[PDB]
Amino acid sequence: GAYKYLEELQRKKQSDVLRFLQRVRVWEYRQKNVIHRAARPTRPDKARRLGYKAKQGFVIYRVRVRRGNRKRPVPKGATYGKPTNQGVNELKYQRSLRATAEERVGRRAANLRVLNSYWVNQDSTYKYFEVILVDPQHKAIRRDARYNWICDPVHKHREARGLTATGKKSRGINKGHKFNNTKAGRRKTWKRQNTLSLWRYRK
């Protein structure tokens, strides 16, 4: 199947063929609007492993988000407060640029629901993404048992609670001693260990 080839040719980003491509494509995006409907997956192997399917009710979107750090707003870098908190410039922001991409298109079509998203390109100003979505009211989705979980109400804006792939990452949810602190969910596991369970027959 032609898909395995695509998967591997994509893993050769310094390869000549790919950067001729990636330099011609990455201009063609910076001309269109920061958010614009894609027409098809430009990485159909990638989409289709990330959950995508070519049938009415699946959507792809290209979104562009500036790179670098979060400059702490704060008028004139003025902090009012202690030295540890006196920084403005070398702070990073806890969610990835994936997330921010997802979140802005998900708001752009609230009637869609963000399935997943993948990285596609980048210059020094922007990182580019294609965000694969699912209209949960399209009946071709609504039947089709496999996807229709997405239709539920608990999967509303799954991408602004970090339940897309990239948000489960930055949320730190993974098993094991590497993730103790953030794993059942950080504030939850926090708040647990900071509760004073008193029994009736006090132990």
């Binding site: 009736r200 027959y201 006090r202």
Partner: protein, 51 residues
Amino acid sequence: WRKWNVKVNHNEKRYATASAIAATAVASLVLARGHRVEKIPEIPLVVSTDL
């Protein structure tokens, strides 16, 4: 989150109820407790199982 309940050693509990069980003999203390019983057959008053 004041205390409200109280732990009693399980055994001290029995020791208590045991002593309370034995006092329900000694005529004097049942009369002491109220209990109009100078007109009862004997103590422990035991009654047919058909009750």
